Design a protein around this nucleic acid. Sequence first.
RNA 1: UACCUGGUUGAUCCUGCCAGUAGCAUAUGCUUGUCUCAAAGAUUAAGCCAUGCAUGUCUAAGUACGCACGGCCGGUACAGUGAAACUGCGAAUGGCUCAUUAAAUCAGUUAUGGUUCCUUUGGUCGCUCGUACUUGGAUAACUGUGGUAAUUCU
RNA 2: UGGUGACUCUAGAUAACCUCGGGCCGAUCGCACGCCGGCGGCGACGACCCAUUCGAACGUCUGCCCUAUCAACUUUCGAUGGUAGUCGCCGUGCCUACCAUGGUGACCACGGGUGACGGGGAAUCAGGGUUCGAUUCCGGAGAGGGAGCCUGAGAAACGGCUACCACAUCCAAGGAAGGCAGCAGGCGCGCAAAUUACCCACUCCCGACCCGGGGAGGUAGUGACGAAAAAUAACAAUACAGGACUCUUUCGAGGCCCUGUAAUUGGAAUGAGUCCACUUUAAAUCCUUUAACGAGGAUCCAUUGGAGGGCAAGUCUGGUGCCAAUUCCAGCUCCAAUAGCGUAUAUU
RNA 3: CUCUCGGCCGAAGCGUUUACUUUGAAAAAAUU
Lengths: 180, 124, 51, 262
Amino acid sequence: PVARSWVCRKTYVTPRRPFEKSRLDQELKLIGEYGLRNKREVWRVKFTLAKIRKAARELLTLDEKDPRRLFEGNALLRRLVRIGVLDEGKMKLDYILGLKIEDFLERRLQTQVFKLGLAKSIHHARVLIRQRHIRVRKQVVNIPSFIVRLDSQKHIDFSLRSPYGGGRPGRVKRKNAKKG
Amino acid sequence: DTVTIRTRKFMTNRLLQRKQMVIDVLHPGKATVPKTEIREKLAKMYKTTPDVIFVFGFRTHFGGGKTTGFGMIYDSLDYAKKNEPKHRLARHGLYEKKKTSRKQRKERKNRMKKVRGTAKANVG
Amino acid sequence: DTRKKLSKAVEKRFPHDKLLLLDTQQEAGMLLRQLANQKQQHLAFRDRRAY
Amino acid sequence: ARGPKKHLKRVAAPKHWMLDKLTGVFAPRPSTGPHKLRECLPLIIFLRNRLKYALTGDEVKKICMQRFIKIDGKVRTDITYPAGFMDVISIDKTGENFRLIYDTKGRFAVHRITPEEAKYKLCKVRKIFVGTKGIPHLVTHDARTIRYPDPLIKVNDTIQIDLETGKITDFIKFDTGNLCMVTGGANLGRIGVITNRERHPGSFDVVHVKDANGNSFATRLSNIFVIGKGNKPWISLPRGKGIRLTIAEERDKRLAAKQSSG
RNA sequence: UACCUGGUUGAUCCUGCCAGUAGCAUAUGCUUGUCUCAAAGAUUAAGCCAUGCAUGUCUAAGUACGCACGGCCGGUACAGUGAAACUGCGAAUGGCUCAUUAAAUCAGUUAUGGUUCCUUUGGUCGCUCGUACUUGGAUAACUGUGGUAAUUCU
RNA sequence: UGGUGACUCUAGAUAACCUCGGGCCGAUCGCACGCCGGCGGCGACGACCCAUUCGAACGUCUGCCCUAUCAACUUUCGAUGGUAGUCGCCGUGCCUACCAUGGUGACCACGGGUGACGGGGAAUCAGGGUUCGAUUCCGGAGAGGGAGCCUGAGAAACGGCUACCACAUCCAAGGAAGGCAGCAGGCGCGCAAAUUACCCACUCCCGACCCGGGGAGGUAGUGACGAAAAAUAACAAUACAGGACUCUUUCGAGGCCCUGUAAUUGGAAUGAGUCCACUUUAAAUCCUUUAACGAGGAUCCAUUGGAGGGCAAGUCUGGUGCCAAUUCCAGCUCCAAUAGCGUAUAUU
RNA sequence: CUCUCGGCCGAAGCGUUUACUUUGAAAAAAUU
């Protein structure tokens, strides 16, 4: 007996057929578009989408006024809207079955740092977050895959402690400036 | 200066003769503020002496702006000497513990239970 | 962590071997005990011959 | 086992205690006493995990050993003493009084009461029997025996009893149209009015209760505690008045409170 | 995501098994920068074990003439701290393993109107018509003499 | 009297009994002292009985894998039932005496096997299923194998005792002591599994107890079992190469853009490391926070496998033998996943 | 679906008995 929990989950699925050209090319498309480190981030987002689709299908097998359908559909729709993947005017479960991996890829912190003009590229965005220059609200966030909510979209900025931000010069610049 | 103290979840615990709260410390570009400095800051905040103030369990957040810990102010030094743990009372120099290991005490105990009578006090 | 590196430095030639520490008399007794009770590698050449 | 078990694992503790998984291997293990193990709140869980006067069990012992805690008017120094339904906890140093009555979700409310309401308690009578020299005795739900009860008091009635004297002050019969709180099963904590009692000989009777909104629910007769006469309760009720809201209405009231306050 | 690729014929379709593939366990090889959690002598041998530790315990409230310490006030039995020892309680919990065990164990359901129960909590505790302003003998710790190679022996 | 669904229940009355190996009816201890020798307030400990609590133990109903190369079994020696008793905490062939001849079985008894402790549960998952569950929760069982007791409320107890069987320790040879399927650790076995560390601070348990103790438990150590996040570069100019758009029928021009590729230049940003201080904690460590140093081949250098018969991936090179074809060896190039990736075996 | 006694109803026999379906009570946590 120990005061430990052993509850833990794999968060991705390896595909059944390893070598098919269309899936490889589409994965490479997404990796290049979004600056992902490897195929496993594609598999991770694909997994969360598959989970959400299974939940929506099992809710849709229920009859229309079933209270579990109303409660759990409202919760699922509210969460998908809250991370900005579904529009607010599309609170219908069937629209969940229309989504794509690219939406949850657009809601990453890497992509939102790229689209807000703090970075010159998507790879510059991953590097910018990973090196403690990006802060959401007033919290330094180091994780590229941090999914940004709609109330947190207008609050992504530069760390008040970063050289590009508040302004203490970095290690290289302070080394070079003291040579002369 | 730039280190500010706020107290969040204040409670006047009249059963353990103290006031206990969560202490939130802001130090935007420094390290984690030492516990003694927080103790004079709480002594200035609550209009008292800092030898009855005990703070513990501070964790700095990721990013460095903020550190949360717990603190409690005792009415007197006597209630502090009664109701505080011995180790927190030792961190302030008010208690000194015995310098013997478990192996030494346990072997002494098992050795002196092979002896009957007041010769028990002669076993090392 | 010194010992950590040491184990790795050893593992290119001694792959699965325990690094005893010989600093004190108590550790010397532990090593002597480990040496007395341990399975013996038998070398065929000297075992077929009286030496 | 070769004799009584003395320990309680944390994951085997009662769920309504609301203990978390990673604090320890063990749960506080109530002592034997006036309430069952699965239907009690030990004093350490109340005074540490609910009221937060103490942060560890050691200073729970420090609060207890100063004789600041009373259950039903008596100083209880044991930190795992089993307190249960309708118990009146008095802490006169802080000047606070509590009654241990259930939430609508089946957990022991932190329910603060008036010092005037701390004087009495309601006990469900659990058996009546005649002892030597023809003396009627009454055994309640928390192991009280009262000599010479009123002859009108039968089993399953509720007696209002005075904590200082230990003598019966009043009683309520088990009738229809009469107010009860559920003390077990899936409907635990709900408060309503008895409408029916379908008797099953050699088996358990089932009592039908109607909520203040019109919701109807049944329980076993052992799960019924009469708490008022007709429609008005004889004690203070907690915030939720025994009306179990559905999860949709819980979500709606939570969002309405967020929108109104914030 | 209710998914495929190949293998017998000169060539075609079939049956039919297999190979690839994917997951889960054990092991193992090569490699390994950071950080969070985290299983871990079950499988074979319920095989065999050196050494150490794993179970003890005192409040104002059972027994203090150990100066082992320690103030009175002096006829005041006993200030107070208190090792030892007697007495009481615990050692039937916890921890380990899976050998046994196949309507046995075990789960759900019921019963004790067929039983016991330390303890906690409540009741009962002048309900008996018949030296007490206090009863008796011991035995430890302690002092002293010892036996045996050897024991938590005496 | 009172109760139950049902008492031979509870309570009542009478005649008595009441075990010396004996049933209650207080020769106990502390703290404050006060009233009219007598009256006393809080407690502590004991205690017959009844209730309660924690159980425990016997029963009820339903539910388990493989085997007929196990078809009849139990019954003298209790197998099924009856009466009376014994014993037990109690109901009962539990045991005894005498009777009755019963009881179970192809709806699979009885016997044997299981790489069988049982459940909660795990993997797969359209669904039905198939496979797994020694293992932290619940229930059982055992302490080398059997057997029998003592104390106690509770044990057929093994960190209790007494024997025998198998092992084994010390000895002055007369004697004495034993039981890691507890925590470490060792030997053996094997394909196969960590430190003879620190602490009662946490969780809780026990005791006369706020105070002592706890290899339970917590903490570090070993740990690529497994699961989570996640570095190994980014940008600008320059030079070529594409692709758009303006002007030209086109060639062409675009200080017109955009996108790639560099034995090309450039300083900006930083961790990995090294190392003060806090913080952490029982004391530490780690993490988190922060000084200082810390990057150009940023040598601070990513591996593991597979490809020239099909899923992803070759019209390649050099040695070596055999009669241009052709056994063995070392490479290049490409593809896949990536701090991970092959293999064996089992299983789905 | 009814026959009696007590306040249009409550008790009683149920109506051949089942298999089936539904409801209600009750049914550890952890895991999912």
